[PDB]
Structures are given as structure tokens and as C-alpha cells.
Amino acid sequence: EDKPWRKPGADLSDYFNYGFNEDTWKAYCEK
Amino acid sequence: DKPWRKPGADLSDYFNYGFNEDTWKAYCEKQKRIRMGLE
Amino acid sequence: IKDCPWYDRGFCKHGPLCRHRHTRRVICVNYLVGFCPEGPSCKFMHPRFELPM
Ligand SMILES: [Zn+2]
Ligand SMILES: [Zn+2]
């Protein structure tokens, strides 16, 4: 995909540090 | 003890990524600040 | 032998006396900021903060 972390089995923490996820990263950036 | 201070000590034996005792402590506080607000 | 998980997190109090290897690595600026789209295949390290036991 455009977004390999969404793929089944992918570990979010290979992409997102600090326990971020797609939703909380977006919110943190868009504050 | 802080055996990495002692003269002749190689800091890189103790710290990875180019950290030192000061930048390591800052990074530990950054972990804490960012993580507290996440699910 | 394994890479020292304390050194991989960034600090190993045992330094040169560690039984594990202290593999020097270069941190990924994007992972340090919070997000890197390269994941496993990133050319730079994504250091975890969880403490080993
Ligand atoms: Zn070690
Ligand atoms: Zn990266």
C-alpha cells in the first residue's frame, strides 16, 4: 500500500515511535 | 557509580547513537513527555 | 552472542565489560521525531525504549 504499517501482521512500532498510532500522530502534528 | 566519566573512558562503549550523559537524560525526559499523552 | 538490548536502547552501564556486543548504530531522525514510513527496511535504527530485564 501507500501505508505498509496498516497491512495485517505489520508492527506499528517499526513506523511509529513513543506508542504513536496513525490517529494520535495525525492529532499531534495537526495541533 | 559512573565509570564512563573516569579519565580514558570511551563514552561510545556506554552510549549508542552519539548520545552523552546529558543528551541521554534529555532523551529520557522526551520519552516521558510524549508517551504520557498517548493511548 | 547477541547485540546488547541495553546498548540498542542507547545506554549500557557495563560499557566494555558487557558480555553482549555493543553494535554502534545511527538513529533515524524521522523515528526520533515520531514517525518513519520506511519501517524495518529503514537504513537507520528505530530504537525502542522498553527496558530489557
Ligand atoms: Zn551491554
Ligand atoms: Zn527510519
Swiss-Prot record, chain A:
Subcellular location(s) per record: Nucleus
Domain of life the protein comes from: Eukaryota
Signal sequence annotation: none
Quaternary structure, from the entry: Component of the cleavage and polyadenylation specificity factor (CPSF) complex, composed of CPSF1, CPSF2, CPSF3, CPSF4 and FIP1L1. Found in a complex with CPSF1, FIP1L1 and PAPOLA. Interacts with CPSF1, CPSF4, CSTF2 and CSTF3. Interacts with AHCYL1 (when phosphorylated); the interaction is direct and associates AHCYL1 with the CPSF complex and RNA. Interacts with NUDT21/CPSF5; this interaction occurs in a RNA sequence-specific manner.
Disease implicated: A chromosomal aberration involving FIP1L1 is found in some cases of hypereosinophilic syndrome. Interstitial chromosomal deletion del(4)(q12q12) causes the fusion of FIP1L1 and PDGFRA (FIP1L1-PDGFRA).
Similarity comment: family membership: Belongs to the FIP1 family.
Primary role: Component of the cleavage and polyadenylation specificity factor (CPSF) complex that plays a key role in pre-mRNA 3'-end formation, recognizing the AAUAAA signal sequence and interacting with poly(A) polymerase and other factors to bring about cleavage and poly(A) addition. FIP1L1 contributes to poly(A) site recognition and stimulates poly(A) addition. Binds to U-rich RNA sequence elements surrounding the poly(A) site. May act to tether poly(A) polymerase to the CPSF complex.
Protein name as it appears in the record: Pre-mRNA 3'-end-processing factor FIP1
Native source organism of the sequence: Homo sapiens (Human)
Whole-protein coverage range: 161 to 191 of 594
Curated annotation (Swiss-Prot), chain C:
Protein family (similarity comment): Belongs to the CPSF4/YTH1 family.
Protein name (database record): Cleavage and polyadenylation specificity factor subunit 4
Native organism: Homo sapiens
Subunit structure: Component of the cleavage and polyadenylation specificity factor (CPSF) complex, composed of CPSF1, CPSF2, CPSF3, CPSF4 and FIP1L1. Interacts with FIP1L1.
Sections of the chain in a coiled coil: none
Gene name linked to the record: CPSF4
Subcellular location per the Swiss-Prot or TrEMBL entry: Nucleus
Full protein segment contained here: 121 to 173 of 269
Task performed by this protein: Component of the cleavage and polyadenylation specificity factor (CPSF) complex that play a key role in pre-mRNA 3'-end formation, recognizing the AAUAAA signal sequence and interacting with poly(A) polymerase and other factors to bring about cleavage and poly(A) addition. CPSF4 binds RNA polymers with a preference for poly(U).
ZnF bounds (C3H1-type): 1-22, 23-49
Lineage: Eukaryota, Metazoa, Chordata, Craniata, Vertebrata
